[PDB]
Design a protein around this nucleic acid. Structure first.
Ligand SMILES: [Ca+2]
Ligand SMILES: [Ca+2]
Lengths: 152, 152
DNA sequence: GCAAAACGTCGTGAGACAGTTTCG
DNA sequence: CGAAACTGTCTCACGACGTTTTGC
């Protein structure tokens, strides 16, 4: 449980509400008990020419990594234990993304107990349904409705 | 001289490096001693549905206004005296737009002294030439080189 | 003459995903 | 079977300007 500075979290909080993104997805995968994977990721996008800023995040936050995708670069943090630790300390300073942040935290908490019941998985599959609305979604496909392919 | 909260500044700073934009322009206007106006402006843009955040900024920052422009809305601060006071307080916490913040501040200071010498005005038109380089410009027209219409 | 407000839009820099592969 | 990586992309939501008008 690595603890972060308050001035660090305050700034970042504003930058996250700015260019950050708190994604939560249900990815269809046959290798999973319920045919879908619950992906949770914290993104931070920026012009590759400004990648150094992204790289600096991997150092300051501790975990995570930075991917390159042409003209733009993202800083990705998908590791659940660390991510839950980050959003726990960050959540109190967010103003725009503070709802999804706490939703993602909620999902992480119920992830183990959602691997058991098909009814719970579907309910957690609903939390993410909420995050997507709160975000500015436009290219979403796999929703909790489709996850009801459980009826077999 | 209104003093802003340190935590308000810490958060806003990240958000400014996020969705904000510190601009400086040279607008061709015949009504001016040198045919050009030195326009300075602090912008903050968000989806019109998230405008409420911009209206909140008008309260917290004390000055400024919010304009509508379709799907998007901007919070604009163009007043010199209050702007200078705001950036002077914000500058230390910025991380991506600190250079331009200060350049703008440099400009404001030498604004009344550039209204006099066509040489001073051409030098300041240069500070702004620097801010644009620092920003992600791609629609710029009137630069200091063009300001050299002073050759009459 | 000039500070500041109006008003319009080019071209992305981003948000928010998707789909597939790897690893243990 | 799952956590987490790797790879790809639609559609903006933004940045950063430009032109014109106030009115004192
Ligand atoms: Ca944004
Ligand atoms: Ca940005």
């Amino acid at each position: 449980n690595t603890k972060y500075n308050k001035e660090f979290l305050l700034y970042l909080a504003g930058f996250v509400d700015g260019d950050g993104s708190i994604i939560a997805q249900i990815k269809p995968n046959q290798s999973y008990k319920f045919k879908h994977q619950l992906s949770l990721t914290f993104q931070v996008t920026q012009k590759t020419q400004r990648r150094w800023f992204l790289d600096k995040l991997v150092d300051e936050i501790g975990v995570g990594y930075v991917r390159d995708r042409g003209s733009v670069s993202d800083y990705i943090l998908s590791e659940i234990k660390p991510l839950h630790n980050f959003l726990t300390q960050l959540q109190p300073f967010l103003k725009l993304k503070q709802k999804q942040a706490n939703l993602v935290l909620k999902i992480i908490e119920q992830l183990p107990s959602a691997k058991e019941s098909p009814d719970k998985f579907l309910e957690v599959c609903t939390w993410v349904d909420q995050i997507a609305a709160l975000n500015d979604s436009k290219t979403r496909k796999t929703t909790s409705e489709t996850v009801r392919a459980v009826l077999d």
